[PDB]
Design a protein around this ligand. Structure first.
Ligand SMILES: CO[C@H]1C[C@@H]2CC[C@@H](C)[C@@](O)(O2)C(=O)C(=O)N2CCCC[C@H]2C(=O)O[C@H]([C@H](C)C[C@@H]2CC[C@@H](O)[C@H](OC)C2)C[C@@H](O)[C@H](C)/C=C(\C)[C@@H](O)[C@@H](OC)C(=O)[C@H](C)C[C@H](C)/C=C/C=C/C=C/1C
Length: 107
């Protein structure tokens, strides 16, 4: 599945409803700690709509339980991320992923 561990707390009240676009700052890395993607390094947040299957299952279930302002470590199982196929040339097969994600605001 997905494990959410809070790094920095949010308001504990404003959770993302379906329909809203979540605007977040993320850093994706493999189980060893090597980064593969980071919106922070680009200085440009990532916007996406929740509950439309836009993102991997770990995000769909993990980001849904975060509050606005919260920063969390999302440890995601390979069947909740890319799985056996992976994402060729970035994420290999059967890869546990770790996302440091911050829910900045909703639009
Ligand atoms: C320029 O950067 C890449 C992202 C890279 C690509 C490589 C990745 C390793 C990683 O580096 O992001 C990564 O960090 C990651 O793992 N992310 C990203 C952050 C959200 C969580 C997760 C992550 O789930 O991303 C997702 C899966 C890759 C594919 C999807 C997993 C669920 C599955 O149902 C989808 O089947 C169609 C495939 C990519 C998403 O971001 C983008 C926004 C969504 C899609 C490509 C599809 O939905 C697509 O459908 C037809 C759409 O509707 C979009 C809105 C259409 C539009 C024309 C194309 C947008 C493409 C944007 C590409 C971006 C932003």
């Amino acid at each position: 599945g997905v494990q959410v561990e809070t790094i920095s707390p949010g308001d504990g009240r404003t959770f993302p409803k379906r329909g809203q676009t979540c605007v977040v700052h993320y850093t994706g890395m493999l189980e060893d700690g090597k980064k593969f993607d980071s919106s922070r390094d680009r200085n440009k947040p990532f916007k996406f709509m929740l509950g439309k299957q836009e993102v991997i299952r770990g995000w769909e279930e993990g980001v849904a339980q975060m509050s606005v302002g919260q920063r969390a470590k999302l440890t995601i199982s390979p069947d909740y991320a890319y799985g056996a196929t992976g994402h060729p040339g970035i994420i290999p097969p059967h890869a546990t992923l770790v996302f440091d994600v911050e829910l900045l605001k909703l639009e």
